[PDB]
Amino acid sequence: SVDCTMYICGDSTECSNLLLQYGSFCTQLKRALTGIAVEQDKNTQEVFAQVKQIYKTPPIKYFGGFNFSQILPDPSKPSKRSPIEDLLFNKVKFNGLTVLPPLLTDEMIAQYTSALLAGTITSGWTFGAGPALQIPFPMQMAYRFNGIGVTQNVLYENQKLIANQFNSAIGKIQDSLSALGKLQDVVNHNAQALNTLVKQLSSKFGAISSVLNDILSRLDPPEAEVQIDRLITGRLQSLQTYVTQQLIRAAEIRASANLAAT
Amino acid sequence: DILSRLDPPEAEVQIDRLITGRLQSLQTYVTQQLIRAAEIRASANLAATKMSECVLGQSKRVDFCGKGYHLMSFPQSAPHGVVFLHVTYVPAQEKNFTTAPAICHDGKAHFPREGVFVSNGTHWFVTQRNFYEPQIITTDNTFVSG
Amino acid sequence: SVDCTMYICGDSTECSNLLLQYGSFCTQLKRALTGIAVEQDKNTQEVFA
Amino acid sequence: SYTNSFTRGVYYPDKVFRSSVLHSTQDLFLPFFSNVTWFHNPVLPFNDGVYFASTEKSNIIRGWIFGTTLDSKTQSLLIVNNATNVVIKVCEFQFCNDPFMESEFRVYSSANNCTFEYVSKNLREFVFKNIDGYFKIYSKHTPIDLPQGFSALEPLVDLPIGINITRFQTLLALHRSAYYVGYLQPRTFLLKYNENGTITDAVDCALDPLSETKCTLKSFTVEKGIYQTSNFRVQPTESIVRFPNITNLCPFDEVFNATRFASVYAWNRKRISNCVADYSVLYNFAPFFAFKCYGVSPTKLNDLCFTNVYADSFVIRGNEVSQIAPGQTGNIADYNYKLPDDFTGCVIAWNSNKLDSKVGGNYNYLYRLFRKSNLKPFERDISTEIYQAGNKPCNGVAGFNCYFPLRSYGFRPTYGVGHQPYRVVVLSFELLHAPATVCGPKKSTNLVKNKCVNFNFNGLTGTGVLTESNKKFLPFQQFGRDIADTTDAVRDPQTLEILDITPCSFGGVSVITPGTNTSNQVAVLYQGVNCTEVPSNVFQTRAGCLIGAEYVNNSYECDIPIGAGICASYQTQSIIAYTMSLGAENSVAYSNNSIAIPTNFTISVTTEILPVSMTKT
Amino acid sequence: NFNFNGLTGTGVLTESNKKFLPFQQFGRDIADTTDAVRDPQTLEILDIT
Ligand SMILES: *[C@@H]1O[C@H](CO)[C@@H](O[C@@H]2O[C@H](CO)[C@@H](O)[C@H](O)[C@H]2NC(C)=O)[C@H](O)[C@H]1NC(C)=O
Ligand SMILES: *[C@@H]1O[C@H](CO)[C@@H](O[C@@H]2O[C@H](CO)[C@@H](O)[C@H](O)[C@H]2NC(C)=O)[C@H](O)[C@H]1NC(C)=O
Ligand SMILES: *[C@@H]1O[C@H](CO)[C@@H](O[C@@H]2O[C@H](CO)[C@@H](O)[C@H](O)[C@H]2NC(C)=O)[C@H](O)[C@H]1NC(C)=O
Ligand SMILES: *[C@@H]1O[C@H](CO)[C@@H](O[C@@H]2O[C@H](CO)[C@@H](O)[C@H](O)[C@H]2NC(C)=O)[C@H](O)[C@H]1NC(C)=O
Ligand SMILES: *[C@@H]1O[C@H](CO)[C@@H](O[C@@H]2O[C@H](CO)[C@@H](O)[C@H](O)[C@H]2NC(C)=O)[C@H](O)[C@H]1NC(C)=O
Ligand SMILES: *[C@@H]1O[C@H](CO)[C@@H](O[C@@H]2O[C@H](CO)[C@@H](O)[C@H](O)[C@H]2NC(C)=O)[C@H](O)[C@H]1NC(C)=O
Ligand SMILES: *[C@@H]1O[C@H](CO)[C@@H](O[C@@H]2O[C@H](CO)[C@@H](O)[C@H](O)[C@H]2NC(C)=O)[C@H](O)[C@H]1NC(C)=O
Ligand SMILES: *[C@@H]1O[C@H](CO)[C@@H](O)[C@H](O)[C@H]1NC(C)=O
Ligand SMILES: *[C@@H]1O[C@H](CO)[C@@H](O)[C@H](O)[C@H]1NC(C)=O
Ligand SMILES: *[C@@H]1O[C@H](CO)[C@@H](O)[C@H](O)[C@H]1NC(C)=O
Ligand SMILES: *[C@@H]1O[C@H](CO)[C@@H](O)[C@H](O)[C@H]1NC(C)=O
Ligand SMILES: *[C@@H]1O[C@H](CO)[C@@H](O)[C@H](O)[C@H]1NC(C)=O
Ligand SMILES: *[C@@H]1O[C@H](CO)[C@@H](O)[C@H](O)[C@H]1NC(C)=O
Ligand SMILES: *[C@@H]1O[C@H](CO)[C@@H](O)[C@H](O)[C@H]1NC(C)=O
Ligand SMILES: *[C@@H]1O[C@H](CO)[C@@H](O)[C@H](O)[C@H]1NC(C)=O
Ligand SMILES: *[C@@H]1O[C@H](CO)[C@@H](O)[C@H](O)[C@H]1NC(C)=O
């Protein structure tokens, strides 16, 4: 969120009466940025908040062999993240600019993910269409092979082999991590727009100076109104560029959130 | 007021200020419509996809044609859009039973052809997975392997 | 791509020095056009390769 | 006294018609729920307009008096209304100090130079204002301590008078055989018009924490939710200007105390350098007799800056000090010392009889009184060539037409004023090309901490809170900047300590409302403001400070989202804050040989709405 | 092309069905554009399409 008056004018009060003479440009900026701010929380709810109840796994945590400890939460942590989630988060104020916090904390998101994991491992896909119906996991895997055209005895006669091979295959995932460039790019693109927006305040745009107080200190009002009006136009153009790009870039992350929710 | 209290060489300067301001505002207006126009088009493409896949067919895609198991959908028109009426199948009133992956008989392993083996406490039956309807375990609804 | 200096000034030293008073507008222009030019090769790899 | 208005003093801001249009206007009104004085009389102030209500079936109020002096010798306004009709009049009056058969009108006794004439229970309201020489009156008479309701007032007159007003009085009908006074302030309202074009309701903006809203949405009905309406900005106090010390005074103390001065014909010349110059030694130094400053004023010697400060000193006779000045003549100023016509220096001159006045003649100080032609400004001539006035060359022998060019004063203590030796010193500045040089002395100002203040550290101008830092500058660096090149630390010139700088503490202000159809209670969130810097129920969240809602330990479904897991609801009434509930808690009875199978089902029907088109423009 | 004591504009004048207050000269639709005036001489409200 950008404070239009503090970005353009900046502290000065003689400027505020001049900025009012350009109409509702500062109202448009606030409305446009609020639209983005509301959609970004909805994007997250649609991807993760697809479960009614918060499911938990049973204490034993032994599902016919298959070992899921690398994707289930670690009870010996303040954050209750999984071992793989701990790796995933280890790789990625100014002149009127502020950053608002998300509505959902990352603890709350972790609770949606653990509910999806606990629902699936114990009831497969039945809880997404109604009540959760328990079935042993080994039998869940056998139905899944049947869905791809493999006869179900292939699992039941080879249950140990598939469970042991799976456990190593999932174990290799950490080695490939210890990738997330698509997540760092989102951070970089916004950091670059905020670093550029601030740097554009040190530009004269063809005026005598770039500071709205220094103009007055060494110039009469009749001519100072012209010099300040040039700087206002230049910095107002900066805000229009910034907000237009945030709308175009927010449509791209929204399309990605729709794919992730799907 | 600009063409009445200024000479021509002085009024041109003031007209350019109005043209610049009003042109900037009008050019902003049209750019914002291009940005919104891409969004309504994307929504219309989703509505067209659901029209084929939810109304002219039966979809298996999860949470694409309502919540539950898709049976059928009916369209209704709206002023600037479309309303879909989605009819879904939802199971209710479950009970627990006991299961086994296979049955041993004559030293051989029997598997269900299209169901699950269940036990009501004393006898074993075969049911279909989405509706409780027990059948006697026979050689007509099972197959042998191993 | 468009070279901002050739478009705006066109081989003129008086104009070229004046471009220094506007800050980093050309930096934004080059990155904006380059960032979408790289995606165009990605678009064709994802369809055929 | 002070009565509590409710929604009173609302008048039609102008002509123009308007149907169903929640129009927003800025003008001079009586604020809603204001403190209005009560009278049952003395001259009252005006300052900016007046609200005037009253109650009574009879007519006790018999006009008003306005103006600047409320007396004769200047024109004033007088408004009366007998049983006929209102009479506006603007003359020069002479008012009774207590103005009031059935004979009346003992208010004034003079009506000169009239510039305007005109002739032609119960609540009688008036609004008076005076803008650009126009004196407006709104009024309405509505039949029934004042009651409670809304009624907009229509224009009554339009009076191109020109009159200034700063005070006024009232007139009452005595017994021989109750009124209100408010004032107007610049406020903003949101006015609701009916289909007939009249004002039926209004919202006072900049008042309650709520209304601060009705003005942002342009409505009188707000739907449940959370609205960003304004912002919080901490303000700086005090202005501290820090600076170095002095290093060197640049000792005037000698040039103005030299025990052996110089005779005028060969006058000494001391040039100041880059220094600290404190002329407060002088202006408040000795007793002095003559101190005249030509280029700059004697007090502004300590806020300018010049390159080379030349200082001349000598001694001369009493009545000749009138010749050390731009553009003079005489045996001394002609050719001993010539000041130019565009002088910028500062002349000081005093009496020194007791210090350079010895008995029996003190023949040390000479003064030339023969020369070919007059001198050049600031030039110097010390020769001793024998003069030649006649036509025969001298060959360096005194006598006839060959005179020695140097004489000597005397100065015995028994002289009158105008012949005792005076000491004269002159200062002269000149700023050739130097970037900076010796300037005046700097007035410090202490240095406070942990407070938002307006600071200046020897040229560095800014605003913010000063705190002890943990950075280490190099032993030549004054201040530091952060990435993006903004100053974030300075060094105090006097104490040589590094202090961090941080802006005040602004942020948005949002209003949390259950909906005007539920309640008029509200809570306010100050976004990322610490609860110690805001200026009951104060709740600290990662999103700021929430005031006006109670935080409970239960967990509900989210209703109004605040942020960082916190929501608000209207349940327990009042307004509360809390941490959202994601959902219930289900524990599936999992085992390695148990299955659940449905025995029944339901057919469910849901809808989905999707936009397909927009308007073609 | 009309002018009503200062109000300058263009449009078609027609008999209205609005009722002004007995101090109002004209009015402005939503978005604040003049859409009706009163004739100073005859005191009748006219719409300005
Ligand atoms: C699930 O896998 C984890 C490893 O990913 C197992 O935990 C490790 O077990 C080995 C011995 O087999 C120990 O040397 C490691 O110290 C264990 N790691 C940790 C973090 O404790 C775990 O035992 C497996 N679970 C089951 C039921 O086999
Ligand atoms: C499991 O289901 C079977 C079939 O319904 C039950 O066995 C029958 O029970 C009925 C009475 O409900 C008797 O009339 C039949 O003779 C029974 N059949 C046989 C082959 O014995 C059985 O009782 C059920 N088990 C439980 C624990 O309810
Ligand atoms: C100019 O010289 C005089 C005398 O040389 C200084 O006066 C002295 O005054 C102080 C204050 O009363 C005494 O304590 C000293 O004893 C005096 N000096 C002597 C030698 O007795 C005077 O201070 C000098 N001017 C300045 C500006 O310092
Ligand atoms: C500037 O002058 C002040 C005095 O006005 C100096 O303050 C002294 O600082 C030292 C430590 O550096 C202390 O021991 C002294 O007691 C201080 N004097 C007083 C009167 O408080 C300060 O050091 C000077 N600054 C510089 C850079 O020389
Ligand atoms: C399936 O059977 C289980 C027990 O084997 C039932 O789960 C228990 O239900 C009681 C309440 O009736 C709870 O107090 C226990 O804590 C439950 N146990 C566990 C492990 O969660 C369950 O209700 C049965 N399901 C159905 C659909 O009848
Ligand atoms: C399956 O559930 C439905 C209800 O969803 C049962 O039908 C209801 O039966 C009760 C009792 O006879 C009636 O009062 C209701 O009117 C019925 N509802 C409807 C919508 O018809 C039905 O009996 C259940 N089936 C079985 C086999 O138990
Ligand atoms: C302005 O003057 C005209 C006449 O020039 C007035 O017109 C009269 O209007 C009344 C009705 O209001 C009619 O009964 C008269 O017959 C009209 N006179 C003529 C000569 O046509 C008009 O009323 C005046 N306007 C105002 C506001 O006084
Ligand atoms: C009028 O307002 C003052 C504060 O400005 C308050 O102290 C006083 O009680 C008010 N008077 C009434 C009658 O409400
Ligand atoms: C009413 O007062 C005015 C002003 O004093 C005066 O001119 C007029 O004659 C009065 N009318 C009567 C009937 O006295
Ligand atoms: C009114 O009287 C004042 C003197 O009191 C005089 O200056 C002024 O000219 C007079 N006005 C007229 C219109 O005669
Ligand atoms: C009213 O008084 C002000 C000074 O307070 C003065 O400048 C102004 O000219 C006066 N107005 C008239 C109409 O005399
Ligand atoms: C005034 O408004 C009322 C509704 O509040 C309506 O019934 C009435 O007709 C209006 N009067 C006129 C003259 O239009
Ligand atoms: C809103 O007000 C109407 C009456 O005007 C009432 O019927 C309705 O219940 C109210 N809604 C709420 C949520 O209180
Ligand atoms: C507010 O400031 C105090 C110190 O004055 C500090 O203890 C507290 O943690 C601060 N609150 C926040 C939210 O930073
Ligand atoms: C909430 O519970 C905590 C302990 O978990 C307690 O310290 C606190 O006082 C409680 N808050 C309220 C409002 O009762
Ligand atoms: C069944 O689960 C129990 C734990 O509840 C476990 O001890 C046992 O080994 C499992 N049986 C088989 C055949 O996997």
Numbering used by the authors:
A (entry chain B): 735 to 826, 854 to 939, 944 to 1027
B (entry chain A): 979 to 1124
C (entry chain C): 735 to 783
D (entry chain A): 27 to 66, 81 to 140, 153 to 172, 187 to 210, 215 to 247, 264 to 621, 640 to 676, 690 to 734
E (entry chain C): 540 to 588
Question: What do the study's own words say?
Answer:
Here we report the cryo-EM structures of the trimeric S proteins from the BA.1, BA.2, BA.3, and BA.4/BA.5 subvariants, with BA.4 and BA.5 sharing the same S protein mutations, each in complex with the surface receptor ACE2. The five sublineages of Omicron exhibit numerous mutations in the S protein, which is responsible for receptor recognition and facilitates fusion with host cells. The RBD may exhibit “up” and “down” conformations in reference to the viral surface, and only the “up” RBD can expose the binding site which is responsible for mediating the interaction with the peptidase domain (PD) of ACE2. This interaction triggers the conformational changes of the trimeric S protein to further expose the fusion peptide in S2, which then facilitates membrane fusion with host cells.
